[PDB]
Amino acid sequence: ADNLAEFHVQNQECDSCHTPDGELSNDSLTYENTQCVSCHGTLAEVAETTKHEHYNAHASHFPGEVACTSCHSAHEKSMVYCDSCHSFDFNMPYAKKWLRDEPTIAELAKDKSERQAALASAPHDTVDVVVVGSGGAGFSAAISATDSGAKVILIEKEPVIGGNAKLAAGGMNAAWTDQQKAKKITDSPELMFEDTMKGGQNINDPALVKVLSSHSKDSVDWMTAMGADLTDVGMMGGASVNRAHRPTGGAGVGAHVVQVLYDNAVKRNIDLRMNTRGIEVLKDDKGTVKGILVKGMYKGYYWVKADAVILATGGFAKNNERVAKLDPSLKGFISTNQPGAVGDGLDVAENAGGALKDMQYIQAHPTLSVKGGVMVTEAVKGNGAILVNREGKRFVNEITTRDKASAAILAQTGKSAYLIFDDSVRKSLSKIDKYIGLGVAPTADSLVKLGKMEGIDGKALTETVARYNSLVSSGKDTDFERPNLPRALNEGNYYAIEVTPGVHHTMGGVMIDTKAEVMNAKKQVIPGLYGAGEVTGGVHGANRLGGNAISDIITFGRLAGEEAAKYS
Ligand SMILES: Cc1cc2nc3c(=O)[nH]c(=O)nc-3n(C[C@H](O)[C@H](O)[C@H](O)COP(=O)(O)OP(=O)(O)OC[C@H]3O[C@@H](n4cnc5c(N)ncnc54)[C@@H](O)[C@@H]3O)c2cc1C
Ligand code: HEM
Ligand code: HEM
Ligand code: HEM
Ligand code: HEM
Ligand SMILES: O=C(O)/C=C/C(=O)O
Ligand code: NA
C-alpha cells in the first residue's frame, strides 16, 4: 500500500472510517478519529504497544486529546508532528519527512474566487465572540467569555492545541500569592511591576505592566480554582524574590496549565475547531468587527458572524526570515518554538487596521540544548546550576539578562557552554529528569570524568565547582555577582548539558490598551477587535522576564474574553 486508506480498504469498507454520505464531519475530523479509536483504542491504549525506553510517539508531553489524524493521514503519506523539534527513531507507516510550508496570509490572496464565494454565502455560524489560537491566551479568553455569558468558537490552525504555551517550563510570575506566603516568600505587586519595568529597560507601556502585576495574583487564583497546581515557587533571573509558580516538585508549568484550560473548556462545552486558520477579520461599513473568514484544512473557506474577534495567535519566533529583518544578529539561529509560530496572526491584525509596536525587540533564550535542539529551562540555573566554558570556568552571572547571558555564551570557545549541576539541583526540579530522559544530560561520579567525557578541562572544572561552592557558603559571588546562590554542587553525581542561544520570544506585536482592545496607528480603538498574549506588544518592552509570558497570557487572555463578552 502507498497510503493508510489503501491498506485498510483491502479488508474494510469506506464507511469503516467515513460518515454514511462520505462527507468529512468537520475540520477536527471528529467522527473519523472516533472510528480509528473504535478499532485501535485511545491514544493511551495505542501507546502501550509502541513503547521505547525513553520516548513514545503516542505518549508525549502534549496536553489535550491529540487526534490520530495529526500524524496519520488516510489518502496520502503524512508527517510525524514530533519531527518538527526532535529526531527520534520512528517507523510510522506511510510517513514522509517533516516539512512545514504554510502559505502566508498575503499568498492566500490568490484564493480570491474561493474567498469571494465564501463571503457571498451565509455565515456558517453566528456567535458572540471568535477566539483565534489555542494557546494559554486563547483558552483563557474562550473560558472567561463563556463564563461571562458569551457564545464562543475557538479555532486553532495546527492539528494540536497549545501553541508555545504547552512548552513552558520555568514558571508563571505573580505576587503576592498565598502560594508564596505558604513558602515563606515576601513579595508585592509593586516589586513585580518595578522588576518588570527595569527588565524591559523602561520601554514597557507602564499601564500594561500595571495590569500584569496587579492582576497576577487573581490569575494564579483563577487557574488554581480551575484545578491547576501552582504551589512550587522558583527563582528566575531579573526577579528580586522567588515568584515563578509551577507544579509540585518543579515540573513544567506549560503543559499543565494548558491541560487544565483544555479540561475546563471541554467541561463548558466550548466549540473548539482544529486545523482551522483565521484568515481575515471582517468589518462592517462603519469599521467595527462583523466576523471572520477562516480556512479549514478539510472543509475549505467559510465565515463566522460575530461581534468580537480576539486574536490570541502567539509570536513569530519560529519565522527566522521575519526575525532577521528585525534583528540581524539572530539570523540563522535555531528556535525554541512550535512550527506554526510564524506571525500570521500579526498579518491578520494589520490587515484589520491594527498597528504593531516594539517589533525590533526579540528575545534569544540563552540555553538551547546543542544535542537535543530544545529549550533547557532557565529554572535549571534558578535552582542552582552554573555555566562553564570548555576551559572549565565560570564566565558570567548565570541569571543575568537573557541578552547578556546569550552574548556571554556565544563569546566562549565553540560558541557554546555547559550547564553544570549535581543531584541536589536535579532532585529540586523534576523538569531536569526530562533532559536526562532526552539523553542530553551526560553524568559521571566526578567532574574530572565528566569533563573528559564532554571536552571540558576536568581539573579546571573540579576547581571551579570547589570555588563556586565556597562562594555559596560565604553567601556572595565575588566573581560574577550572581545575586542568588541557592545550592552547593556537592550531592551525588554531576551533570553537564551543552547549551547555546536560540530565538524564543517576540516582545512586539499588536498595540492594545488596558482592555486588550486593538488600536490603529492613530491610537483609535478598532471596535470588536481584541489581542491577548505574545501576539501583542507593549507589555514586556525591550526584554521579557522569565515567567512573565505565562502571567501575561492568562491575565490578558482572561481580561479580553470578559471585555469582548461585555462589548458583546
Ligand atoms: C519552549 C518554550 C518554553 C517557554 N517557557 C516559558 C515559562 O516558563 N514561563 C513564561 O513566562 N514564558 C515561557 N515561554 C513564553 C510563552 O510560553 C509564550 O510566550 C506563550 O506561549 C504565549 O502564549 P499565547 O497564548 O500568546 O500563544 P501560543 O501559546 O503560542 O498560542 C497561539 C496559538 O495560535 C495559533 N495560531 C496562530 N496563528 C493562527 C491563525 N491565523 N489561526 C488560528 N490559529 C492560529 C497557534 O498555531 C498557537 O497554537 C516559553 C516559550 C517556549 C517556546
Ligand atoms: C483512522 C484514520 C485510523 C488510523 C489512523 C489507523 C491506523 C493504523 C495504522 C498506522 C495501521 C498499520 C498499517 C500498516 O501496517 O501498514 C493500521 C492497521 C490496521 N487497522 Fe487501522 N487505523 C484507523 C482506522 C481503523 C478502523 C476504522 C479499523 C476497523 C474498523 C482499523 C483496523 C485495523 C486493522 C485490523 C489493522 C491491521 C493490524 C491489526 O491491528 O490487526 N483501523 N491502522
Ligand atoms: C473507500 C474506498 C474510501 C473512499 C471512497 C474515501 C473517500 C474520501 C474522500 C473523497 C476524501 C476527501 C473528501 C473532501 O476533501 O471533502 C477523504 C478523506 C479522508 N478519508 Fe477517506 N475514503 C475511503 C476510505 C477511507 C478509510 C478506510 C479511511 C480510514 C483508514 C479514511 C479516512 C479519511 C480521512 C482521515 C480523510 C481526511 C484526509 C486524509 O486523511 O487523507 N477513508 N476520503
Ligand atoms: C510528538 C508528539 C512529540 C513527542 C513524542 C516528544 C517526546 C519528547 C520526549 C520523550 C522528551 C524527553 C522528556 C520526556 O520524556 O517527556 C521531550 C522533551 C522535550 N520536547 Fe518533545 N516530543 C514531541 C514533540 C515536541 C515538539 C513538537 C516540540 C517543540 C515545539 C517539543 C519540545 C520539547 C522540549 C522543549 C523538551 C525538553 C523537556 C521539556 O521541556 O519537558 N517536543 N519530548
Ligand atoms: C490515535 C489514537 C492514533 C492511532 C489509533 C494510531 C495508530 C497507530 C498504529 C496502529 C501504529 C502501528 C503500531 C505497530 O507497531 O504495529 C502507529 C505507529 C506510529 N504512530 Fe500512531 N496512531 C495515533 C496517533 C498518532 C499521533 C497523534 C502521532 C504523532 C504525534 C502518531 C505517530 C506515530 C508514529 C511515529 C508511529 C511509529 C511508532 C514507532 O516507530 O515507534 N500516531 N500508530
Ligand atoms: O523556562 C524558561 O527558561 C523560560 C522562561 C520564559 O521564557 O519565560
Ligand atoms: Na509580543
Tab-separated table of C-alpha atoms in Angstrom, residues 17-35 69 124 273-274 298-299 302:
chain	number	residue	atom	x	y	z
A	17	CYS	CA	-13.915	5.459	8.610
A	18	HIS	CA	-16.436	7.737	6.925
A	19	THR	CA	-19.953	9.029	7.733
A	20	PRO	CA	-22.815	7.480	5.662
A	21	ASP	CA	-22.722	10.140	2.902
A	22	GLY	CA	-18.908	10.203	2.858
A	23	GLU	CA	-18.553	13.858	3.731
A	24	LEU	CA	-15.880	14.922	6.253
A	25	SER	CA	-17.551	15.578	9.618
A	26	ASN	CA	-15.683	18.850	10.373
A	27	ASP	CA	-12.167	20.335	10.351
A	28	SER	CA	-11.202	18.410	13.528
A	29	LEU	CA	-12.159	15.115	11.762
A	30	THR	CA	-14.033	14.216	14.981
A	31	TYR	CA	-16.115	11.400	13.515
A	32	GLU	CA	-13.216	9.904	11.534
A	33	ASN	CA	-10.836	9.933	14.545
A	34	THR	CA	-13.614	8.326	16.614
A	35	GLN	CA	-13.507	5.421	14.121
A	69	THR	CA	-5.006	12.401	12.022
A	124	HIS	CA	-21.618	29.135	8.695
A	273	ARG	CA	-12.034	23.640	15.958
A	274	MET	CA	-8.659	22.224	14.925
A	298	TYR	CA	-10.635	19.843	5.189
A	299	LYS	CA	-13.826	21.836	4.747
A	302	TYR	CA	-16.147	29.821	5.405
